[PDB]
Amino acid sequence: SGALDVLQMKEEDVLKFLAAGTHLGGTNLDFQMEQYIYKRKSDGIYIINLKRTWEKLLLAARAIVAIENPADVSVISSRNTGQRAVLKFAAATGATPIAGRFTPGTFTNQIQAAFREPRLLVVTDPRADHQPLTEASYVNLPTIALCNTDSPLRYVDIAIPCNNKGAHSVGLMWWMLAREVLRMRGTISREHPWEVMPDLYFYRDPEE
RNA sequence: AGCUCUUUCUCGAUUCUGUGGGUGGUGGUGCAUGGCCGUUCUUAGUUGGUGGAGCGAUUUGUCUGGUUAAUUCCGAUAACG
C-alpha cells in the first residue's frame, strides 16, 4: 500500500479472519491459484495467506468506489450462504442485489422486463454462478469474485481469496468489503470501530 | 303433327331469305378451377418474436423426473415472455 497504517493490516481483523476460518482453504490448487497459497499443512488443507488477502481486498474495493453513481454495481449469489450476506451489502452501499437463480439472458436481451445493465459485477464462487460470468463478456463488464483455492479463473479480472465453503467465512468477507468502501468514499472513516456487526451478514441457518 | 302432298282462303311487315354474330347443352375434362365434404387424426399436436448454440441445412424454447384423459400441471432449466 503506502499509507501509514490506515490502509494496512490492523491487529483486530486478524483475529476475526482466524475465528471465522477464512485462512483455511480447500484440498486442490490450480495453476493460477498458487500465488496466494503459501504452503500445505500436515493435513490436506492448503493455507491461504492473509497478507495476500489484505492487499487484494483493497484495490478490489477501490474499483467498486470509482463509479460515480453506485446503483449499478450488481451483486449476485445463488448459493444459500451468500444470500443473507449480499442483501445487507446492497442495503449498506448502493448496489442492486440478484439473489437466487439468475435467469439467464439478463443483460443479453433487449426485451425482458427484468433487463439490467450494470457496469461491474461482484460474484460469489465462480463455479456456482457460471451463467452471469459467461454473459459478462457479451456486454464488456469488469468482474470481481471470491475464489476458493481451486475455482476456475477465467473472466475474473481480480480475485479476493477466501475459504468460502460456507460457515462464517462467507458473511465475514462481504462485511469487510462493505467496511472498506465506506471508509474511502463516505465519511464513516474514523479508524475506530464500525458500529455494524459482522454477525448479521452471516447465513440465516435453520433456527431454534 | 297442315309433318308432307292434293285443294285455297286467312293473317299483314311482327316476319322471311343470305351472311356475319351468337345462344343453348345432365357434352368432355374433378389432372384447368371455386365452393363443399371425406380422410390422414380424434390421438395431442402446431408456430413466430427477442436472445443463445452452429460456416450452414437447423436447433434451443416445445424438458431428466413426478402427474394428468390431455404440449394437463408441478418442478427442473440458455432461455424469457
From Swiss-Prot:
Ubl conjugation listed as a keyword: yes
Site of covalent link Glycyl lysine isopeptide (Lys-Gly) (interchain with G-Cter in SUMO2): 88
CC terms in the record's Gene Ontology section: cytosolic small ribosomal subunit; nucleus; plasma membrane
Region (Interaction with PPP1R16B): 53-112
Region of interest called Laminin-binding, as start-end residue ranges on this chain: 160-179
Residue(s) carrying Phosphothreonine: 96
A GO molecular function held by the record: structural constituent of ribosome
Site label Cleavage, positions: 114-115, 132-133
Modification Phosphoserine occurs at: 42
Entry comment on modification after translation: Acylated. Acylation may be a prerequisite for conversion of the monomeric 37 kDa laminin receptor precursor (37LRP) to the mature dimeric 67 kDa laminin receptor (67LR), and may provide a mechanism for membrane association.
GO biological process: ribosomal small subunit assembly; translation
Modified residues (N-acetylserine): 1
Modified residues (N6-acetyllysine): 51, 88
Subcellular location: Cell membrane; Cytoplasm; Nucleus
Keyword list, A-Z: Acetylation, Cell membrane, Cytoplasm, Host cell receptor for virus entry, Host-virus interaction, Isopeptide bond, Membrane, Nucleus, Phosphoprotein, Receptor, Repeat, Ribonucleoprotein, Ribosomal protein, Ubl conjugation
Assembly, per entry: Monomer (37LRP) and homodimer (67LR). Component of the small ribosomal subunit. Mature ribosomes consist of a small (40S) and a large (60S) subunit. The 40S subunit contains about 33 different proteins and 1 molecule of RNA (18S). The 60S subunit contains about 49 different proteins and 3 molecules of RNA (28S, 5.8S and 5S). Interacts with RPS21. Interacts with several laminins including at least LAMB1. Interacts with MDK. The mature dimeric form interacts with PPP1R16B (via its fourth ankyrin repeat). Interacts with PPP1CA only in the presence of PPP1R16B.
Extra remark: This protein appears to have acquired a second function as a laminin receptor specifically in the vertebrate lineage.
Family designation: Belongs to the universal ribosomal protein uS2 family.
Main function: Required for the assembly and/or stability of the 40S ribosomal subunit. Required for the processing of the 20S rRNA-precursor to mature 18S rRNA in a late step of the maturation of 40S ribosomal subunits. Also functions as a cell surface receptor for laminin. Plays a role in cell adhesion to the basement membrane and in the consequent activation of signaling transduction pathways. May play a role in cell fate determination and tissue morphogenesis. Also acts as a receptor for several other ligands, including the pathogenic prion protein, viruses, and bacteria.
The protein's name in its UniProt record: Small ribosomal subunit protein uS2
Gene from which this protein is expressed: RPSA
Included range, full protein: 2 to 209 of 295
